[PDB]
Symmetry: C3
Subunit: 114 residues, 3 copies
């Protein structure tokens, strides 16, 4: 699993523990060891959401499996909660695109997971 | 709909009003209300297109529906036209990836759109 | 084909010529002309892999075809090798997401491909 957040929140507003918190929470949510989880936060972005430049986030969650209708609804609550508390983003200004990756289409360690 | 532009054009070259213009032009193109539209512009990027560092862009349009053969041609004309007029990027140094997202795979406000 | 690498290594760690090399090597690997190859390198990112901040990368390769089981293994070996030799990123701290794009879903030069 790989989680990416793109936001107009300033860099100084991103807590130093946020990547570790996300790692850990996503391990619990997906049932995967934290070692497998990658997280990426991109602050200071030129963005608008609904025509407004109030705090917002455009995010992606990729996983080989563990993606689906009910799971994604659950992830949205987890992730909106974390973004709300730690980045002070309203949950209605967050989009999360979910990608169920085929193992043959994820490279790692000189090969793929297939 | 969510539109992202990644470009090597410098930040000072992005006009005031660009994000608003994109929002408005996308609302017209897609028929979706501007409240649901997100736009994200990322200048000053280390990029090459065709081995050259002349102005270029790599973009993405995600939408739940409103993606398809003729629609995407229309969008490419619109969006390359904006990049050319506003950012002075040649249309032949732009790629736009189009993604027709399943509503179950788009999270927003503590749920998905399914 | 379009290749994007996001990394926590610093910009000064990216060697002169890296985007050229990537262009060249990807042309060789995909068989596509270099003119159509786009590369994008994003250093100095706020990242974690497995909860560690040691050098890592999150990458994407998009191509209209030339994506598949064996191909992707080959590309992973290539690209992990480059990131290791050039950017001193361990291969086991790189993920590469591969995307086989439908030509109708790729915009370029005011239109889309087929
Ligand atoms: C998230 S995409 N993790 C990739 C992965 C999956 C299974 C085992 N190891 C890494
Ligand atoms: C762009 S991805 N807008 C989101 C959306 C689209 C259609 C219906 N509801 C939300
Ligand atoms: C990479 S996505 N290159 C795009 C492309 C592919 C084939 C022919 N022309 C452009």
């Amino acid at each position: 699993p790989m989680f990416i957040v793109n936001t107009n929140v300033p860099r100084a507003s991103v807590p130093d523990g946020f990547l570790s918190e996300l790692t850990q929470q996503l391990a619990q949510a997906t049932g995967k060891p934290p070692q497998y989880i990658a997280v990426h936060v991109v602050p200071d972005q030129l963005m608008a959401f609904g025509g407004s430049s109030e705090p917002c986030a455009l995010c992606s969650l990729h996983s080989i499996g563990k993606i689906g209708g009910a799971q994604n609804r659950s992830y949205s609550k987890l992730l909106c909660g974390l973004l709300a508390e730690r980045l002070r983003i309203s949950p209605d200004r967050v989009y999360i695109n979910y990608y169920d990756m085929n193992a043959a289409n994820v490279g790692w360690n000189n090969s793929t997971f297939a």
